[PDB]
Design a protein around this ligand. Sequence first.
Ligand code: ADP
Ligand code: ADP
Ligand code: MG
Ligand code: MG
Lengths: 419, 419, 206
Amino acid sequence: MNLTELKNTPVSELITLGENMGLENLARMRKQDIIFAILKQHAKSGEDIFGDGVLEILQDGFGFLRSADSSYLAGPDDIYVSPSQIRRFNLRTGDTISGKIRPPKEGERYFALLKVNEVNFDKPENARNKILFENLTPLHANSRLRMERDNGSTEDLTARVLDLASPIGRGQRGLIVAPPKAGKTMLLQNIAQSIAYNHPDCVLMVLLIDERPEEVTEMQRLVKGEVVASTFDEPASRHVQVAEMVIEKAKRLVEHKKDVIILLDSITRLARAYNTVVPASGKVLTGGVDANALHRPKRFFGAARNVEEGGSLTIIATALIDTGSKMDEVIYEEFKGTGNMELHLSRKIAEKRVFPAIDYNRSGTRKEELLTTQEELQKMWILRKIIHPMGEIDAMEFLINKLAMTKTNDDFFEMMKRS
Amino acid sequence: MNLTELKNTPVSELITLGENMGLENLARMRKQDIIFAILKQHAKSGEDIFGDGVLEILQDGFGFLRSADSSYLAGPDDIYVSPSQIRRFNLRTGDTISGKIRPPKEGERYFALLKVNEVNFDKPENARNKILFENLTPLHANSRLRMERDNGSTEDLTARVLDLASPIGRGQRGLIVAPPKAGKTMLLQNIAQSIAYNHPDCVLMVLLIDERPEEVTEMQRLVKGEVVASTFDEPASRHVQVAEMVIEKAKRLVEHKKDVIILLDSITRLARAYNTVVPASGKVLTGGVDANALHRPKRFFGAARNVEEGGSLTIIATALIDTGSKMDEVIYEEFKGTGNMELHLSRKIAEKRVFPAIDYNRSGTRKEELLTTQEELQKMWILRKIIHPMGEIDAMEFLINKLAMTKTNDDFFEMMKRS
Amino acid sequence: EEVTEMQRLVKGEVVASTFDEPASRHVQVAEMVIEKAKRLVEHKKDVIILLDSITRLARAYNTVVPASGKVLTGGVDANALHRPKRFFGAARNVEEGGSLTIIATALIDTGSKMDEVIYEEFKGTGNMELHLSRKIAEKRVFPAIDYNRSGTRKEELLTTQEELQKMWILRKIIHPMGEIDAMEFLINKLAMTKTNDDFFEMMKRS
Ligand SMILES: Nc1ncnc2c1ncn2[C@@H]1O[C@H](COP(=O)(O)OP(=O)(O)O)[C@@H](O)[C@H]1O
Ligand SMILES: Nc1ncnc2c1ncn2[C@@H]1O[C@H](COP(=O)(O)OP(=O)(O)O)[C@@H](O)[C@H]1O
Ligand SMILES: [Mg+2]
Ligand SMILES: [Mg+2]
């Protein structure tokens, strides 16, 4: 009846559903084709069919309603919307549209939208009056996103260390710097669990670029939110498309006074896709990266801000360093001081089998007075006073044993004042 | 009626204003497009429309009237001026023009200027006879800009320390040297507050290059003057454009016997933009900076001077050191002895959580006899006689406690003579 | 319709031949005008002829003149083009007195092979060249004149010593720029100047 649940159902249930409807030879076809075949057979029955998706306005004028299940990939089951709907209902890219759809008339291969009754989880009339994201005035982060989980076991202290190293708030534009094989993949998993548990209201989005297929499955099964990704086999034009879709969708949610958190991975890989797709403008910098090529990722990364009117957009990205590629290090140079939060991971700490491998001295956040209270903020200052003299390799080891014997970070603070 | 107040009004008021005029679908558009749409509807009504902006003469011959609200960014609402106006009214880049404008006729997408009745806040006839800035004879600073604020609380002693460290006067060309995360961002805020409070007559301009969007908003909300900035997402060609617009506007104000103060931030980042935009001339120095590339920032920085005929131009810039980039340190070498005032901030003082982190021994000013009185000048000499022997790390700590127990710097002077 | 507006606008006698008239009529009109023009020159009188178009005129001569057994590219006989060259070449300045000025328009890029071969024979036969660019015309900027390609030969006699050298410096700054934007540069500069003399002094200013 509704396209939303058909994609969520496994392929095995779809095969059984299609067989009783009279369809045949469905197991050997793709999942997208099965959905189209099932809808087509149900469409001619006469019962109304609903749908949902994310609008993607093309340069021609007509758009499509991509689905987050397929990672916003074009497919036969995508809903086609004529430019007339964009006229009557003023819509932009990334808008969420849910409504009745009609069977595709002969001469067209895509379903068409009949009527719109829900735009961005709101009435269509109210969505027309929402202020644009650009017109919103950015501000510093005010409310802190707690990272410590009470249910979290003492085996993994990554969540607790992040609170001591660099607190994160709504609208933060933090950047993660880490060499390869430094544990950055599961570092975001701890952040995703903490955000989902401590702040269920916040919308969590995980974006993966050039990630292995196995990595995508575990992220979807672990993160309590919608996760989109693009495998390495997909062309470069697909990687940029996924990134553009997520940021546009995130901006629309911000306009509705809603908080959305994006865990980008990785900014270095994302800039590679933009460099390839964007044609050369005649100016080539070191490493073969065009100056105009890096303009797009900066605008995407810089969109993170705290809106004074309401809502916030928090973007956390991982930067790859010491990867052996000249093109990778030059990108990190452009994104050096562009973030208000720095989280540097050390390779030499990681090889010592001590986790989390966080360089406490280098990592930090800017304007942390607003995030933390008066007492909590000054308790971190004295902690940094005793961690700075010691080496970074043993600095993490010092915190690991101290945090192990303390149930919570509050107990750790009073222990430090004891000596 | 007038374009000046439309930009100052928030977006919410613009939406309400447009709706009663018959416009529709304005919330989803940019603020610049809303202004153009509102003006277009009001233009066909018949009532006269005024305008204001800063002239930007292009290489073709025609100019535009950029607005300081949009940080001198090209937009649909910019006023177009034909070369005929530049002929009849001899105008240069950076001139402020205010006058009636006409609706755009078909075949043009920009408003046109009808008549000019105010040039540089003066009659157009008188502005034609103003002497060029280059012909003015520079001189040393004579009148000192007081930095100590009576209303200033004892919690922040940064304003008082600057008076003891290095006094600043009109036409000063001071340079600030500080490592990253040394408190330079709010250091200029204290200077901006002192200049606005002690000397409301002086025109204060704050220029930010490659600054985060959140940093821009707080500067505008705090500085009692017009503030222009360029975010990191904007291309390199935008950063140079903003810098050129400010200096040209500042020079024109000086020609009208007016004092203008520019708080540049940062000179290191500004030189990066010039290096990228300027094509290579075949000669490459250390770090990849062309010799001709650094010529433009030196001319911009060197424009600060005290005019004997009248007025002054004070430029204060922050230089980034110990940033880990080879290109950053070579730029500082060229700007080492180019400033008559030196203000060095120490990283090791900053990490001790003692502020302001100012290296008193290294910081100083040249030709301070004119700025200070006979008694005040010699009182600083004895102070430097007792601060030089002690280390720079504890030198600031010595001043902090001494200034805390003294209400004003005058009371601090007599206390030193007591012992 | 084109004939009527020319007669109502040109302050002189205008002759024309419509397309419906046979080819033998087109040659007859051309022969009558040149013969009349020559007689006026003999009486120490100046006559100016605005021919339009030389390409179309050669078509009429090619049709009426019988083939001589030799056919060039495009089907134009060598002897067929002899007559238009003599007609076009009659323009000259008479030392004894009077003059004969002939200005003709040549059609190019018309999609016809016969039209382009005719232009080849009339390439270097004129002492003045005035080339119009199609891409400038479609930009809705007029006149669409290719300044770099257009020019005249032996212009020292026509212009004065000061005026001639003022054009040389103008060509020195128009040659580097593209022909599409060269006309746009002149249009704005000439708009702000009342006369060409004021345009000359403006250029040296910068
Ligand atoms: N908090 C942690 N606790 C235990 N092991 C960790 C932790 N973080 C990382 N690791 C180790 O790192 C390895 C995975 O690293 P990975 O996340 O793939 O790095 P990268 O993403 O840079 O390739 C695992 O084998 C795991 O043992
Ligand atoms: N005068 C001051 N009083 C108190 N704290 C200060 C002062 N100056 C700087 N700071 C500290 O510096 C931090 C901000 O540094 P910032 O200005 O961002 O340095 P940078 O601009 O080099 O990054 C704040 O957390 C603040 O606590
Ligand atoms: Mg990984
Ligand atoms: Mg700063």
